[PDB]
Structure formats: structure tokens, C-alpha cells
Amino acid sequence: WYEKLHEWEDALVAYDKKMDTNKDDPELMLGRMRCLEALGEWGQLHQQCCEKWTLVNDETQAKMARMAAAAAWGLGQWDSMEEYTCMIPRDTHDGAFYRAVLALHQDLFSLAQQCIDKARDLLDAELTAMAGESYSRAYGAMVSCHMLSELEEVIQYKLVPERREIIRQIWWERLQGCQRIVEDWQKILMVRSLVVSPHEDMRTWLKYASLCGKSGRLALAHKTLVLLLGVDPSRQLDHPLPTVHPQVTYAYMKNMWKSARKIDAFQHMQHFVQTMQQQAQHAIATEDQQHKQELHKLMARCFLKLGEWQLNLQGINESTIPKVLQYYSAATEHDRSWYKAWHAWAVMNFEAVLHYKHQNQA
Amino acid sequence: GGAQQRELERMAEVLVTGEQLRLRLHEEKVIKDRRHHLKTYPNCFVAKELIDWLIEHKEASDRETAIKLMQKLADRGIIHHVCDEHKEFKDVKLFYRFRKDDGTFPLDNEVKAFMRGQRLYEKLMSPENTLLQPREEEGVKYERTFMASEFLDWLVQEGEATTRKEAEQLCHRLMEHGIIQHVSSKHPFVDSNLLYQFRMNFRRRRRLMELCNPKSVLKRPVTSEELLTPGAPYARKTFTIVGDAVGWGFVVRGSKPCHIQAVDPSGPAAAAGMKVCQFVVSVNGLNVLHVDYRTVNNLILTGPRTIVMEVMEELEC
Amino acid sequence: TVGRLSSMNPAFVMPFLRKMLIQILTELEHSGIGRIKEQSARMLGHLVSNAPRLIRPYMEPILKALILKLKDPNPGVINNVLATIGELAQVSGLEMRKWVDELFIIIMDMLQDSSLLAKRQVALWTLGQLVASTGYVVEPYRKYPTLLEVLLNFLKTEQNQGTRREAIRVLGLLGALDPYKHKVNI
């Protein structure tokens, strides 16, 4: 019942109760594979499928192969995903898609072209029938053909080196029309990983981490952030946060405020904003076209965030009011023509007026 | 315990009690958000009221004792006065708040070292790090004994300090404070078997008044020599497999003999025999009896679409 | 053959190639015969489909001539100019940007409200070829609030496998917009 509601976290614990107390037939175990695949935890999925890959029926392991292959692909173990691929039924959409992507990795471009063509006609039957009801019904299949055309651009990415500057520009706005679903973005982003690493495009993965935390699991949004930084800030607290990649570290501090570690975020934010003015200055090289405006654009957000948290943590105080006006006033001049900078500053002055009037009348 | 213990440990202990005190007070609701004349004040506790709570719980006998303890706390900075910056405890209903509630929160090298040490000690207390055990070095058994070599290994493995050099330098600072002391001579931290005794204990806080990858299929461990010898049940057969629109559908994963790992039941290979329990020695003419499985993989792919393959095909033995 | 052969020995080929190109352009704009114009367009496509480096600076004289042909106030001529634009959209990435807006109107008219059951495979194939190279992907779903509906209708009506396999590729290259934005676009 939980799976039909797309609510996976309580589905997994429900399957755990029916299995931890007692091992049962190979149908409760297969239910978790459909739950760990949707959750996005390839570490636990691989150990379960690899251990059980032998003491199961041949027909039973045919169902497991599709979920087992995805976990190996997500973990980078290319020596074993080849094994899991060759039992996926070859007269299915997933049976050709999962072996088309296998040809790209091992550099077989002629073989992959037929597999993409063979995968298109298999999806034709599942698409024309669903399109006869409504467009909304035929969306789970249209996102599948969306990834089929993204594999043809992977071949073009690895062949002509002069196009690897607009290929990762078409991939950006083509992702702004799809529905904001974590499962949908987890599949498309995994396809665009055979060629481009996350370190080559923060602009796309940062919007993925924000979406994961905003509407889904905060745990997923946290492991994808320490992957970009290169170090895990949660392990060591006394050391300052990494300074390079100012955009990435800005998003990390927002995550801390949403979680329990509110206290840490406020202090780290003070240090970060301070270290920027020194980095902003002492720069003989001039990049006012893009970099200087980008540095200035980030300053306004940081100052705005700082003011709000100090008001949340300490309240409106006779002492606090002058402090946040310094933060808000400095934010307005860094990035003018920003609505949330002027409106917020104006409101704070208005609030200050009200407080003073109440004080001297009592 | 000398100057090292008397200074640093005492500072550590007051913080531990302040945290213990704050947690109790929050449960007791002494610190709660307040609004005075339509102006807010979060996490506030009135000074005068607190004295009553202490007397009931017996922490402070009378107003004098409570004031003295609070004055000592102020001299440290663990608390501050929200309404005014005098920050001197008074027996008046005035809102105060702990530095740990982020009103100020100054952090010193000592505080940062102590807090990390406390968190590490919780790990040591926890099963996650179970190295703490009664062990004997230099002829004496001491509790909470963990080998210095084991600790340095654990730090890298746990990831608290991935770099061993960084970890080792950090331990010296803790040793200077006295948090960890070698059981016998307090020998400085080295990657050696030296057992250590944790002088600092997290529990029993001070009182206020006192201040995997592979699977494998074939049963046979090795069949290379038996295959090489002429006399064995295996009868060799040669299979020529034609390509398909989506691929042949077979995998070879034998290190020395290159035995077939798996075959797609609906694929072309399964149609032309090609059972899982087989061994190959030559492909498209070239003899590959002694090569790695990977080397075999590259050769077969680069060849023509149709592959000439020789299968050992053991006869049910 | 010579276009491939011109890439290694340009000392002799370029003069002859330039003369041939000029003659083809003259035939397109001077000779008012439907048979001659079809012949010239097909020959031009082979030259550009085989020697892309030499043709790339010459988008402006070729593309403008082809567009004016499509707006003449004959099945043979249309099926060849549409294919030729297919190769011109691959040689010039992100360069055919000021012509895409005026090119959908010509192309979309041959797919939607097609008064004649002509060859739509050429139009469908070239439509997905000049959007995978231009990069113009999600925006066209707005100005033409009919393109998504007609592409879906092509699945059931058409029976040829070649056309069926091409209406799926165009559906993927353009995007996978959420069902709500479809409602907003009516």
C-alpha cells in the first residue's frame, strides 16, 4: 500500500518488520529493492543483491537484475554491472536501454546506435496506448524517451571536442521544463555522468541538492553537498568551512539552519562574510564583467541571511535593532535593484519606529 | 593533578556543569521565550526567579550562595544579561541567557579542544569505538586502556582526522591539557602500543556548589592443469556465434582459464548451446588458453561480429 | 569523391569547386524550371555532407537562397531542399540562430494542416536535426501551442516504422515538459 502512495521511507520499515522478525519467501526481499532504488541508497542495495545473487531461482533473479544493475551503475563498479545486464530481458525497454549505456562506457559507438534505435520502437507501444487517455497519463513514458535522446548527445559529446561548451548548455534549459520530481532528476542526472563529472557543473547539481532538501529527503541533499566540497564539514567543527567555490559553501550553510545545527550555521556565516571583503579587495586583476558582479551578487544574499537569523535567534532587542540595520544597509548597496533587499530594510525601519513609540508611551 | 589539571580541567568542568544545568533548566522550563510590552525576547529566564529554583533543588542554600555561583559563571562568560550590558547577576527579575544559546558564544582554543574531546569520548563510550578495555602494559592493568597505535589507526579509519600527521599533532594539545594521559609515564602520543588512560570522564558532571564485489559461479577452484592434460572427461567443442541487433549476450570472467560467467537465456549464445559451465582456450583462431579475462574481453570485442569460440564443455563431471 | 579528396590537396580543387558552386546558385535563381532546381539542390548537399570545413563560412549565400525557394508563390524540389538544410544545420552549430525562428513556420506548415499527404519523413527528420544543433529546445512549445498535439497524433495515424522512430526522437530532443505547463499553453 505504501508503494502505491509513492511514500517509500515508511514502506522500507514496513518491509523490515516483516523480514527482521523472520526471513520469508523471495517476495518481501524483492519489495525492498524497489524501495532502496527509489530512495537512492546504492550502498545498501549492492550488498543485498550481490549476496543473494546465487541462492535464488533463475526466474526470481531475472526480476532482481534491473534493480541490481542500477545500483552497480550508481556505485561505479563497472566490472560487475556487465554481469547484471545480461539477464535483463532483451525484449523490453529497460533491456535495451541498460545495455546501450553499457556500450558507451566501454567505447563501442556503432553497437550503441542500434540499441538506441531498438529501444525507440519498443517504447512506441507503451507510448501510443498511454497517449490515448491524456497527456498526464503518458508522462512516465515521455520522460523515458527524453533520456533516449540524451544518449545520442553523449555520443556527440565524446566524438567532437569543439561542442563540449553548448552541449552542457542545452542540458540546462532542457532540465527546466521537466517536472520537479526527485526520482525523475535522479535518472536523468545519472545518465549525464558518463561524460561530465559533478565538479564540471555546479550550476545543475546545486539546484538538485536544493530540490532534494526542499521537498524530499534531507539526508540525500547532504551527501551530495559533501561530494562537491571534497571534504565533510560535519566531521570537524572547529575548522573553518572551505573557502573555494563560494556558491557551494553558501548552500551548505543554508542546509545547517534547516537542520538542528542552527547554532553552528550562524557562527560560520559570520566568518564567511568577513573573509569575503578581504578576498574582494587585494585583487589587482580586474574581472568586473562577470566575476566582480558575481562576487557582489553573493554578498547581498549573505548579509540578508545574517540579519534574519540574528533576529530569529535573539529577537527584536534594543541592542539587536541597530545591529541588523548595519547588515541590511550594507546588503542594499552591494546589489541594488533587488526587491528583497529594499523591502526588508524598509520594513525593519518601520518596525523600529513602532517599538520606540510603544516604549516612550509607557 | 598539577597545574595542567587544576587550570584546564576546572575550566572544562564548569562548562560541563553549565551544559548539565542548562539541559535541566530547559526541561524545567526556566528558560523560555518571553515578550515584554509587545516586544519579544527569546530563550529568556528571569534572574530573581531562578534563585528559588536552585533553593528547591538544593543547588544554592540561600541568596548569597546563588549570587556567588552566578558571579563566578559571569567571570567566565557562560551567561550574559539580555536587557543590559552590565552582565552582573542581580536578585531582580531580569532576563538572562547562556552564551551557548548563541547570544554571544565566544569560543577559545580550550573550548574547541574540550568540545571535540567530549564528542570523541562519547564515541569512545559508544560501541562504535570499543577500544576502551582493561589492558596491561608495564605490568599494571588499567581501565579505559586503548593502544596509542590503535587510536591513531582509529582516527584515520573513523575520519575525525583523516591525515595521521594532523591527528598526531592534535593529540599533543589534548595531552597538554591532560584529557588523555599515557597510563604509566604520560609518554607523548606516538604511533606505538602505549596504552592510555582517559583522565577526563564525561559522566558524573560536577555540582554547581562545587564551583561483496564479486560472486563466482563455477565450483572448481582451478581447472587449468586438468584441461591441459589430455585425459579428462572434458570433450572440446567449437561454437561459432553470429551477432545480434543488441549484442551476443555472453560474459567471460575466468582469470586463467577464462570460463564463461553468464549467458543470456534469450540471447543468441544460449540458442547455440553455450552453457554457463564452460571453458574457452581459443577465440577466432588465436589461442587464449593463458591470459587474463580482461585481455580476452578486449580482443573479442575488436574482432568481427561473428566469433569463432572453442568451449571446453565438461561432460557433467 | 572530390570533396573528400579536396581536404588533402587544395592547391588544384578549390578553383573548380568554386566555379561549380556558382553555377548551382545561378541555376537556383535564374532557371525557372522545377527539374533543374531539384538537380542542383541534391548535388549541393553531397558537397556539404562530405566537405564540411570548406562550406561552413558559406552559410549566408546558401541558406538564404534555400529559404526563398521554400516560399515560392512540385514534390521533387521540396523533398531535396529540406534534406539539404539537414546537413547545413550540422555544419554550423549555434550559427543558425537568426534563421530558426523563420524556419519553423515553413516546416510546421508542412506537418500541421498538411493539405497533401506528401512525404512528412523529411520534414520530421529535419525538424529534429536543426533543434539538436541550434540548441533551441524548450521555448518552441510556447509560441506554437499545437506542436505537441500533432506529434502525438502522428503516433497512432502513421504506420511506417521510419516515421514512427522519428516522431519519438523529436519528442525527446524538444523536452519532457510537465503536464501543467501543457495546460498553461492550452
Partner: peptide, 14 residues
């Protein structure tokens, strides 16, 4: 004839 042959840059109409 082979699975690992790179396709031509400018594919013509089939």
C-alpha cells in the same frame, strides 16, 4: 563491419 567503428560526422538522409 564491426561494433567499435565511429560514425561519420555529417550523417545524410536515409
Amino acid at each position: 563491419m564491426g561494433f567499435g567503428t565511429k560514425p561519420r560526422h555529417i550523417t545524410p538522409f536515409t
